[PDB]
Design a protein around this ligand. Sequence first.
Ligand SMILES: [Br-]
Ligand SMILES: [Br-]
Ligand SMILES: [Br-]
Lengths: 6, 348
Amino acid sequence: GMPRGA
Amino acid sequence: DKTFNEFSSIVNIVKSQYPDREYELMKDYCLNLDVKTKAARSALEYADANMFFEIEDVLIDSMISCNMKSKEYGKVYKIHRELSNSVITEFEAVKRLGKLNIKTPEMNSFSRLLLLYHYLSTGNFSPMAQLIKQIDLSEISENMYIRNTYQTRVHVLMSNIKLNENSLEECREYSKKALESTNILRFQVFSYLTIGNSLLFSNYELAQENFLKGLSISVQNENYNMIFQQALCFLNNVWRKENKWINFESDSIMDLQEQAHCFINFNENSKAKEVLDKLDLLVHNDNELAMHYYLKGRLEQNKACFYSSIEYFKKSNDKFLIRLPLLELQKMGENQKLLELLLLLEHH
Ligand SMILES: [Br-]
Ligand SMILES: [Br-]
Ligand SMILES: [Br-]
């Protein structure tokens, strides 16, 4: 999938 | 033998004069601070924002052990650490935060931030927009290092919320604000990641350029390096290009999915079904499951799988990645008014 982060 | 009245003074000097030994020097400096002080409370935020879990966990335990302010900071940073490690559920976190009767503006801000991180990481985006609006950093009056690091955190989180809302120009503007507001690698990493992600469906070269910028600042950090490899892997699958970024030695859902996506892209459906046959056996959060159904829909050319895909994108409130099964349903000649209606309606 698509990596996400903050 | 004394502290600066704002933590940024010693941070900026260390980054200016000794940048390659920032961790070594700051780890020594922080771990010798008196936990009762504003410097130690500042160092706790510095360590968390940098994901220096070793430093932060020792500051947390000490602060809780033995003043009023420092204890509160320790206790809700510990809730953030426990929730981010699944030691406690969201319900336990919220129950605990409530029982703390939090008084500082700082920890009332961070109590909301820690839930936002948990929603992002578990693919449950619907609560985020309303919760982040409750934060009012202008109330933080005494500790400017924390007001300013929280300001960066909020920009990066806002960028992710705008991405999840498919408001892509605003997404990029918030990560650009984050980059201008910060000297912390962790926030630069997620800023470049989110900018690159926002370009995934429209601008291959600029998406790639942002992920590669992320790679360049992440060299010495295997987790951040992995993230941009994964971002590049997804980019190249979206565009159905040769994919030099696939991790064939991984059994994470993230990496397995991209194996399958690439197999489907290049007409190796038997190999893709193998992968998807491995994936059905794993616990997916809603947003991961949406992607799973999209991949099965492409493998099976079955509209029901694309409908299940948008169901879970709607559930996770992801208005960005839902473009994938929507594009597939269009190619299969689905009624345009049908697709408009599904876009209009909401999961409740
Ligand atoms: Br004490
Ligand atoms: Br492949
Ligand atoms: Br299906």
